[PDB]
Amino acid sequence: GLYPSYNTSPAAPDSTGMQSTAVQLAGKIRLGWNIGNTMEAIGGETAWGNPMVSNELLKLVKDSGFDAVRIPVAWDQYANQESAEISAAWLNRVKQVVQMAIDNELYVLINIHWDGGWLENNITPAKKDENNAKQKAFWEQIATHLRDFDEHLLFAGTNAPNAENAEQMDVLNSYLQTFVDAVRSTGGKNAYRVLVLQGPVTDIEKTNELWTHMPADTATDRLMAEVHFYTPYNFALMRQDESWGKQFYYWGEGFLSTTDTERNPTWGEEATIDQLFDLMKTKFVDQGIPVVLGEFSAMRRTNLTGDALTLHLAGRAYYHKYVTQQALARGLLPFYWDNGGNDNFSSGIFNRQQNTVFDQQVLDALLEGA
Ligand SMILES: *[C@H]1O[C@H](CO)[C@@H](O[C@@H]2O[C@H](CO[C@H]3OC[C@@H](O)[C@H](O)[C@H]3O)[C@@H](O[C@@H]3O[C@H](CO[C@H]4OC[C@@H](O)[C@H](O)[C@H]4O)[C@@H](O[C@@H]4O[C@H](CO)[C@@H](O)[C@H](O)[C@H]4O)[C@H](O)[C@H]3O)[C@H](O)[C@H]2O)[C@H](O)[C@H]1F
């Protein structure tokens, strides 16, 4: 025992408000919104330029057409490093955000995010034992504190674990098992809660290649898989050209340039999106395991001027509709990655300071795809 036990009040198993299976719950969610760069920000909830989460925001998210929110949460910076005890004040703040999301009739997925990297960048044999110990200690606390919420609340054990090979995959399977056991151990509604497990690098191709089995669960039919999606990188995230490749400003049938043609895609088009999603349908969905698509977005390039900009914006919108639509058609639940920014290279579709829509075009694209 590196750390004390935090499974200090285990409760009797409680199935009340927990009647849905993972498949049934996935049936209720078609469009999801990440509260990005907020509860996971290093330095505090407001450290990365977003205000504290308010009811008014969650209300706008609901009223705009989202069924669910994914809330990235940081924990390690709030914990005593000797004991792994998480601040009581932080636990209550997270609980409070969950409560308000569930009061606006949203499903809610809470994780341990990148979190400064303690687990995420350490899917390795040398770190396996210490990280399991912290995974267990944190999840005991988070689950105990959030135990009484009904099936509107789901937990995801990690964010984007960096497992690049079979030996790292084995370590990841260990981290994911530690998460399930920790949560189930607390009892209460946590005996039945739907949990979400992440694939290697949350990458479709690597998941298809390395994923072996789901963790063992004392509960029946209560697990989902998770991947993320930024294909093609050159369009969605790349901000400068490199020796290895050029940025794409434009994407989709009908929105390609004839003037700056080096800025059209050379890969990662519709057929590729289709092919990648079909891998997750076969590995998971077709086997009765839904798949959460926890993170996707193509950033805005507002450093373009004139018809270049207009064309980028059209393709950028279509990209979000196509991903949303083609993911839903295959049993993946799309959660848009929103960082709150309204400036160049950002992904915020709301203006968080005013509780209004900043990017109506991408909002409509998402809803149409939905
Ligand atoms: C899936 O991928 C998503 C897309 O990459 C991830 O979201 C992105 O997260 C990074 C944080 O990265 C850490 O967590 C993820 C790990 O994979 C990384 O290895 C870690 O480094 C965010 O970057 C942070 O952004 C904040 C906020 O400001 C920026 O973003 C908003 C935009 O409007 C603005 O123009 C950007 O400047 C940065 O905080 C600011 O920093 C400056 C400089 O010190 C300071 O003046 C500001 O006051 C301060 O607010 C921060 O330094 C930067 O790391 C991405 O914005 C986010 O999209 C997702 O986490 C992953 F799971």
Automatic annotation (TrEMBL):
An annotated Gene Ontology molecular function: cellulase activity
GO cellular component, one term: cell surface
EC number: 3.2.1.4
Residues covered by the Glycoside hydrolase family domain: 37-342
Record keywords: Carbohydrate metabolism, Cellulose degradation, Glycosidase, Hydrolase, Polysaccharide degradation
A GO BP entry: cellulose catabolic process
Similarity section: Belongs to the glycosyl hydrolase 5 (cellulase A) family.
Name of the protein in question: Cellulase, putative, cel5D
Organism name: Cellvibrio japonicus (strain Ueda107) (Pseudomonas fluorescens subsp. cellulosa)
Taxonomy of the source species: Bacteria, Pseudomonadati, Pseudomonadota, Gammaproteobacteria, Cellvibrionales
